């Protein structure tokens, strides 16, 4: 667009403006047509130095670069297709219990419109791969994604809960002892 | 992934709003009262006293479920009996009138304005301006909030 | 009938969260920030700013008996603030189970719970659960096919009304058994179970605001159709003995309330409030509350939530408005 | 750049640079010029010597009228045979030059004006025919309409350098006339050219330019005068314009610039149409800026 | 040319319902003269006719004789101009707007309506009165 | 009825100021978003009746109302081809310069000349009566400036012809 | 009409260059500058004309700056002038081959496409980038078919420079890497250096630059030729002589020694990071064919310096990996080439391409824009 | 995965 | 980049 932040600084300011003015597009074609036809969606953001900049399609585009890794330069299916293939690789009897329970974690997941967009993408991917165009039984899918305001610290809360639970028994841990002997190998006790 | 516009799930709500008294099977599915009252307005125009004809024609009003020929004939007779009126007595007629009547009048005026090549629209704009100056924006906001089909 | 503008409030308010002594209050700024103002000498000032949410807020309320504050956010959450023994505050989160953003919130007259109408097809009622340190929320989703616009309470915690997005305004109950509340045999219904969908009372246009008379009967509501309706029911299942509608010429109006068992007040897009008497024998408006109808009045933009004053629970004798252009004002009578 | 140039600025600059300097270079390039004509600036054998070549579409029709005589009269110390067709060629030696005097710049300008130089023998023939016809009328004032009619279709020429654009000409009693038949593809450009031609017609009304020649035009129907030519006629998109000049307008001291102007007529017209489009764009941006000012006034603060 | 271009530029911008009259009287006394016929450039005359038919159709409130003055200054224009001899530029819309303002005249009004109708029918009685 | 311009103007102004009753609204589609419902067209309950006004077939004004935003399309009278081209170019350039107004639309709706768009943030920041007054002033100055531009083009052509015939 | 010769135009922050196809040398090269002020105010000029102007009250300004168009009005005026005065061509009977930076946005792309298709009523148009053409201008014959396509181009425009790792005629959109140096910044630095000691502004600076500015494998181990032989203190005159000092010896090192003017990373490290970000199965070729472009890049010993630096860096990395593993790997071979093309390789490549008949088909037709509109081209 | 059901 | 090979 013309604005450059080549300095090592301003990275935090760009991060702040991203977390402040960003949202996923429930309908990418609709958002593109809106940005191309209307003057709305264009915002003006100030900087710490004092100058001001204008932001447009990038707002709804960066969640697409998240969704489309090929846009960034990586060869991967994405996120919705990734989790879909991961679940399909499991046993059928588990698949349902996974579509009914889906949680998220991390500040990157707080992009506006991400959960419902992911749900719609999963629904479309199922409709395409499995039913091949038979919407007669699509409503009988029962997908229930989960989201909360504490995904920013879900890992921390879980670590605290696990520490409070395991603070009694010291066997499950790896004491300072038994380290010089086979310390590294002790770390293999967690992941076989 | 792909784009297929999945909409079968979470269907919208269209008929729930705009309650429909269309369940009559009289003057809306058979077009009887309309054909009985239109000749009355025509005779009123012929004799000259078009105000009473308009008043009698405004008693019943159709709806916009599926039929458009009957409502188009209604609107044509409407535009005719309106053009047959002079440039006076409209203030008295609107002052001695109800609210739903004025709402239907404005709705039909707009539906007629939607096709200028088939009508005049000048007397229609005049009537609309007079109604606005008499009643106010209430009628406009009521007709704008009426059923999407009429 | 006395224009008594108090503060400018540069940014939009959408609420005023008045206090009991009319000294301090809490309003919004069309942004995640929420401003708590305190009474200065013949003036006011931004005593504090919360700025705890991430997205913009839509509604707040001030519980007098507990000196508590509640606020919703478009981020699908709510916050509750308590005045600590010192001048500081104690904030707590409320993760009301929802899918879409929030639209309105209001405390209960007993200050034991607060209801929240969201942008989804569901309303929620939250209460601080004892024996623990959090709040529990219960849903109401069977009716209200579409989103909702506003809601209002009832003398008793039960019989909460909701003005929805559709052309109808519903009424449900928020009764709970674990809480220390009990219903009462009323004309509105019997045995008041949780949902107990009682009436719908359809109308024209949107439903921007509803209202309960000081008594449990004589419901009212108005919306975008430039019309206000009042229902005087007689039995829960049977239709009402009288459903009096009143249309006018002015622009639509919202945030209505009751200044008396018979008198009613309201305002909104019309830059000045009105005054009307609604009785079972007839409902009609008498006069406005301005010199006549910059602009030739006090407000110069859409009038947001309008709140009552102490007076007497029967007659308030005055009220307050906080337009979207700031310029918070009070009007006698 | 209202009055377009009557030569090739690129060739002029190249010649002025090579002549004023001494360092040669192996040059091999091609250039395009209006009427879809081509120029070649080769230097195959000697880095000092140059071989220029000119390719036009109506070279046979031109030589039919006689142009080689004018070429060998204005040139001959530098003429050359066509190396490979190209419809005309010429050679020059960068070393054997007369001098660095103004004759050098004159020769460079003459070379740069090769297009109008080769497209001038028809007009010269017309003027000579007009002169002898006027002399005849002097010794025979009677039969003016008869002599004019018998000269019509007798002393008349046409050129079709373009696929559809044509230029016809013929003299008459103490005056001469020329006609341009052009095409308009875009409707906006057609309307702009029509209004420009109307203004041209209504331009002689000014007293300061009363001595200018006269001009008329037609949208689709051409005059009956040239109705018999093979050129396309009766075309909605094909517009005809006619200039008529008197004796003075082609005087022995101005006929050169006159023919050059008549040649660049169409290019000037098109360039001015586009410049008027740009002018309307400028007025539009000015007025939308005024609208923005009004809207900001309407806005508070 | 300066006179005509300035006059048309001022008429396109002016909004006073009384000052335009003075310019209209100037136009009348200018066109009535035969020597002045065709003095206005064609394109200028075309846009003048365009703004004339405009101000006639979208005329302001009826409380004004501007329509009568426009018809009075138009009826002699087409008779002593340059658009008379060749295929007329715009006459269909002209007569259409004339008939429109004619039917719009409430014949039950005062003498002003009768005078305007007389002037209009006088305009409509153009020698060629080309139809379709 | 002569002078239809003033009645048409009063009617369009009244209906516009009536439909201009916007209000904050959160999209009930995906998450915590605010989109123009009249533009997206995915909520019939939000979309109100589309109103139309016209004094003649050559001119039209359509308006689509909602709770979150509003759209106002207009097609201006244009009979000549040069007039059509000039109007198209002027309106296209104006819509290209749709960053300082905050209300214009980069592209119009098919079948009309231009389409203004208004939202809730506008009426909250600036007023509305002045906005509609500016819309009207533009509705007239469009044709005013079309005529002025035709006059300027005539003058440019005259100057070009004069300089051409003088250089001749 | 796809049969005549196509016109090749290339606008730039420093110099606009336009001419025809099938030519060994470009045409109409000049510094891309415009000058302007009953009433029209249309008297303006461009190029060397505008440069010589401003003595009679003609203003001046640069249409394009920082590698991005800024004023479409002046850009169209410039194009009209260059197309109807300098070249007596017809935009209808000839196809156009335009070049835009890899960062040009779709708004500007479609604006140019429209202003060219509508105002100039063109017939065939093709917009491309500078990387692929500059690369195609690398090889000499262009017909033996033994040429190579996988390369790493670095174009140093007079206003901005950038690097593109092209692989088999498939441009990359991620590994692209820009830098605002290698342009007029060097001239401004040399001017500020000169204005400090010797008051006698920027014309002489660029002149002495193009005349004598060269590089050195080192600077501090260098400076010794200066301390020893005063012969390096050349004397350049415009109007008197000036002491060169060490500008000719310091200016170009701004690339290998960044953060000296208005921070950045050296060029070897930048190109190494670019090649690493690119896929792994193309680095062996990317390091092989590293072609250059842009006048500011055609220095004396630029290629040798860059090659030595990148080679030592890659050798250190591979030696670290080796001594960590213990085997012996095959040292990758890095090469650099610049064969009388780094000056104006863009136009040469554009003409060499347009010489093919497929150009007439790959172009955009007027009817396409008429039916589809200005939304034909979106992105590479 | 490519067995129209399991795997 | 910090995987001793790819990325
Ligand atoms: N032999 C040379 N050695 C070093 N630098 C040179 C040499 N020749 C020219 N330059 C530099 O190159 C610059 C001119 O660059 P040029 O105009 O060719 O870039 P450009 O192609 O216009 O870039 P863009 O297209 O991005 O504008 C001059 O400022 C000059 O300093
Ligand atoms: Mg360059």
Protein model, in words:
This is part of a larger assembly, with nine protein chains of eight kinds. Chain C is mostly beta strands and 333 residues long. Chain C has a single domain, classed as Methylamine Dehydrogenase, Chain H (7 Propeller). Chain C has no helices and 26 strands. Chain C has strands spanning 4-7, 25-28, 34-40, 43-49, 57-63, 68-73, 77-83, 89-94, 102-107, 114-118, 123-129, 134-140, 148-152, 160-164, 169-172, 209-212, 219-222, 227-231, 243-247, 254-258, 263-267, 274-279, 282-288, 303-308, 318-323, 326-332. In chain C, the strands form seven sheets. A four-stranded antiparallel sheet of chain C has the order 1-26-25-24, with no helix packed on it. In chain C, strands 5-6-7-8 form a four-stranded antiparallel sheet, with no helix packed on it. By secondary structure, chain E is mainly α. In chain E, 58% of the residues lie in helices and 0% in strands. In chain E, helix 5 runs antiparallel to helix 6. Chain F is an alpha+beta fold and 168 residues long. Chain F contains five helices and four strands; from the N terminus they run H-H-E-E-E-H-E-H-H. In chain F, helix 3 (81-96) crosses helix 5. Chains in contact: A-B, A-C, A-F, A-G, A-H, B-C, B-F, C-F, D-E, D-F, D-G, E-F, G-I. At the D-F interface, helix 8 and helix 9 of D face helix 3 and helix 5 of F. Bound molecules: adenosine-5'-triphosphate and magnesium ion. Adenosine-5'-triphosphate (ATP) binds at residues 12-15, 67, 157-159, 206, 209-210, 213, 294-296, 298-299 of chain G.
